[PDB]
Design a protein around this ligand. Structure first.
Ligand SMILES: Nc1nc2c(ncn2[C@@H]2O[C@H](COP(=O)(O)O)[C@@H](O)[C@H]2O)c(=O)[nH]1
Ligand SMILES: Nc1nc2c(ncn2[C@@H]2O[C@H](COP(=O)(O)O)[C@@H](O)[C@H]2O)c(=O)[nH]1
Ligand SMILES: Nc1nc2c(ncn2[C@@H]2O[C@H](COP(=O)(O)O)[C@@H](O)[C@H]2O)c(=O)[nH]1
Ligand SMILES: Nc1nc2c(ncn2[C@@H]2O[C@H](COP(=O)(O)O)[C@@H](O)[C@H]2O)c(=O)[nH]1
Ligand SMILES: [Mg+2]
Ligand SMILES: [Mg+2]
Lengths: 470, 475
């Protein structure tokens, strides 16, 4: 999922659509935008589909207002993918809407408490409707009107004591403004930016990625700190206050590996640069543990791995060539597999021992089939290098990973995987290597959230119980 | 535009859609597919839009048959871009449909003759409806049923005598089969492939690009020769026959420069490799003519130039970094009471306090280039140099590449330095036509001459220059 929120001094409908389009890689199952018009009323458009399919002119026309949020949803299986989309809304207290990227690990416990204590009905399976409600109930506690920044921060604080997991949220309160907050372990991404229209007017915005500020011409200010909350009034006044008991930066590693765009700077780290670095280290590993290997060229499996493979070729002093081309358009198969996504440039494989480079291997299907494609194009020996370490555990913080059994690496040794996928050789990046590759870009980040690679969940509240429940 | 045709022994509806999705880069203005059912009747579906948007399940469900053709229309300005899409169809003789990529230079002359001579009404501006009518009238001249291959071939040859220009065409004749033919100068691309099923059951297909064959698992057989024609009967028999008086290979240079996919082999040339070569040459040209220039990195302008710039970096021994990212999804900009940044984003870190050499495939109107350069300056770039993989574009392509009017061409009537100034580049350098020709040629020396009208103003076909002289004979 991806989120954006603008606190402008002029129409934001187009800007949000535009920010959501550069954040579309984070989710295409559904999209939604909601603003607050001059009458302090919410205007909302949300449906399944791409951003470009969801918002038509009639819809934009209706999304009037100078403050608003948007959300693109990654088809989180389980949560219907045909279920109600975000942003979510509640009429009381005040009027609240919230968009969120992440996942609560105590969602069940939360909806039960909400039902018992507050009588708040949760219509969906989305733990975001849950978050919105916890946050709403905390704001229900205040008497005087309007709430003051502290009240709002106290509510976020109270909320953080209750919910557990990963989350980057942006929300809006009728008659008050916009609030954006981030979980205590700083897992899911969120950045703040601003745009001065003139000497006295300044707009603010937050997004899951810096690309969204970039495309709108907002100047990047900084990442929102772990546990921190930001409250921008309808008058453009900004407030920030730490709302978690023990904030620590454990940014998701996978954002760097695959999930995030290369032109984004998450937690001071350039995704591109980190990615090149993963190349350097992986090249070096191949060079250590595979010195006696005979390959004629390095071939990247587009897109992620394109610059990673180039680096690997540099390190190995071997030639880099584009053997695969990713189809820019993919059509559906009607009820009347990787080949529909990729095409092998025959001339680059014919009678060559090749080293293919991929960002990861989740299930192994793609990898096996890509390898078959190489063999069919004339390749003698086909070796596979994964820019990311083995993926053996599930992510429960907002990256939708297949079931533990679906993970080919799950319970299988590299060789057993190499065999199943039919590669002549298979090599993965060392977790420690990937860490250093990314860490090198900002050494103040000591630890990352790497549950998918090592079964260690920073929130320390995961066991087979939650897993099996899923 | 892009075309595909498949004479199969099993439903082709999915296979055509799949071939059109890999040919989508050739036109996204509209699409159309048309097959022949068991009852020897055409089933068609054409609308404006992307392949993915045009063909819904109800439509596919209706496209029954084992033979069909498809088309993806590049928004040809002038031809409405909201006009009737191809493939086109006529009920007589026999029942004919034709999909076409290219351009007729004597279209005006052609609809006049058709009206006058045969009373054939042309309902659109598409010279493709023209081409379908000429071919239809010529086939009309035959008495015995069915026509034999030679009759069809005779028809095509007759047609080639009449029309003038560039064209790759696939067509179908009810009760007969599929035909495909290419112009006498071999300009517009067309290839043939097959997919064997058994002891004699073999399917054939033609497409504007080998990628369509690859993706469908057809074995690449070969390009269709200039002026050649191909006829596959409904039974699976393949006939081929030269139908031009003086066939020559003058393939479009711009297909190699930009238009075609890198994984396609047009006229024995690999587009990728041709492209890389373009970098080599341009690198070397920069090294000769610029030597005293200080740059810190080579940065491509996605997507075409990515590998070209890589080579230019190699030759210049300068580092290559990805300073621009192409947005994968662009949306509508509504009209509430086309920006380059809507298409591209600059990776700030890669420009900050550096002198950059930006490599782009070409400069048409100059707007993009100008704005891309501003983007580089705003990202902290000190000096910004622009390299064009293609020579200066100063003329209009009247053969099938939609180029904006010659007034819009920034290169039209301007010196390199005047363009550099207009685009705000610290330095500007173009590829040499001769170098680019060698660059592509190096891949298949049998090609002695390309179609380069956009760059050299030399119109390979007959009627373009003769008519220049007819013009000056008035003023
Ligand atoms: N150039 C470009 N890359 C993108 C865009 N959105 C996502 N990406 C990158 O695309 C990759 C997609 O992975 P793939 O499956 O193509 O290897 C990810 O590494 C992601 O960073 C986009 O809009 N433009
Ligand atoms: N990877 C890939 N490249 C494509 C596809 N279709 C066209 N292209 C390339 O996209 C480029 C588009 O040019 P651009 O304006 O993006 O630089 C052309 O060089 C063309 O070869 C496709 O489906 N996949
Ligand atoms: N991890 C991941 N990879 C994806 C996704 N969609 C496409 N891919 C591509 O598929 C590869 C994983 O393929 P698998 O081995 O699961 O069949 C990745 O390298 C990536 O480029 C996605 O949603 N998640
Ligand atoms: N020649 C050409 N370039 C196009 C087209 N659509 C996008 N482009 C991109 O735009 C550049 C030309 O931009 P112009 O100078 O016309 O503003 C090319 O380098 C190419 O990447 C098109 O239809 N034709
Ligand atoms: Mg991959
Ligand atoms: Mg370009």
């Amino acid at each position: 999922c991806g989120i954006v929120g603008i606190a402008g001094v002029m129409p934001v409908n187009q800007s949000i659509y535009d920010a959501l389009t550069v954040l579309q890689h984070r989710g295409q199952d559904a999209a939604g935008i909601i603003t607050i018009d001059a009458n302090n009323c919410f205007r909302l458009r949300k449906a399944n589909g791409l951003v470009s399919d969801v918002f038509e002119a009639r819809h934009m026309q209706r999304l009037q207002g100078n403050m608003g949020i948007g959300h693109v949803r990654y088809p989180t299986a389980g949560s219907s993918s045909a279920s109600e989309a975000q942003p979510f809304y509640v009429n009381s207290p005040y009027g609240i809407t919230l968009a969120h990227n992440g996942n609560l690990t105590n969602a069940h416990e939360l909806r039960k408490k909400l039902f018992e204590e507050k009588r708040r009905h949760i219509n969906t399976t989305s733990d975001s409707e849950i978050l919105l409600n916890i946050f709403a109930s905390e704001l229900d506690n205040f008497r005087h009107y309007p709430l003051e920044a502290d009240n709002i921060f106290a509510a976020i604080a109270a909320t953080n004591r209750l919910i557990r997991g990963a989350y980057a949220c942006v929300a809006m309160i009728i008659g008050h403004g916009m609030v954006a907050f981030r979980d205590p372990n700083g897992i899911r991404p969120l950045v703040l930016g601003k745009r001065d229209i003139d000497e006295n007017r300044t707009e603010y915005m937050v997004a899951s990625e810096s690309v969204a500020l970039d495309t709108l011409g907002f100047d990047f200010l900084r990442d929102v700190a772990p546990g921190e909350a930001i409250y921008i009034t309808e008058e453009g006044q900004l407030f920030t206050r730490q709302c978690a008991d023990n904030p620590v930066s454990n940014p998701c590693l996978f954002e760097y590996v695959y999930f995030a765009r290369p032109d984004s700077f998450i937690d001071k780290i350039s995704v591109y640069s980190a990615r090149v670095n993963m190349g350097t280290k992986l090249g070096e590993k191949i060079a250590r543990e595979w010195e006696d290997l005979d390959i004629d060229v390095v071939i990247p499996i587009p897109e992620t791995s394109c610059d990673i493979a180039l680096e690997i070729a540099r390190i190995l002093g071997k030639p880099y060539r584009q053997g695969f081309v990713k189809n820019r358009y993919v059509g559906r198969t009607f009820i009347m597999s990787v080949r529909r996504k990729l095409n092998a440039n025959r001339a680059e494989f014919r009678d060559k021992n090749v080293l293919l480079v991929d960002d990861s291997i989740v299930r192994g299907t793609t990898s096996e089939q890509i390898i078959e494609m190489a063999r069919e194009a004339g390749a003698k020996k086909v070796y596979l290098a994964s820019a990311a370490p083995e993926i053996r555990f599930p992510n429960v913080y907002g990256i939708d990973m297949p079931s533990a059994t679906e993970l080919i690496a799950h319970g299988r040794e590299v060789d057993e995987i190499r065999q199943i996928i039919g590669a002549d050789g298979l090599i993965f990046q060392d977790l420690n290597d990937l860490i250093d590759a990314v860490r090198a870009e900002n050494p103040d980040i000591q630890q990352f959230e790497c549950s998918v690679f090592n079964g260690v969940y920073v929130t320390k509240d995961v066991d087979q119980g939650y897993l099996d429940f899923l």
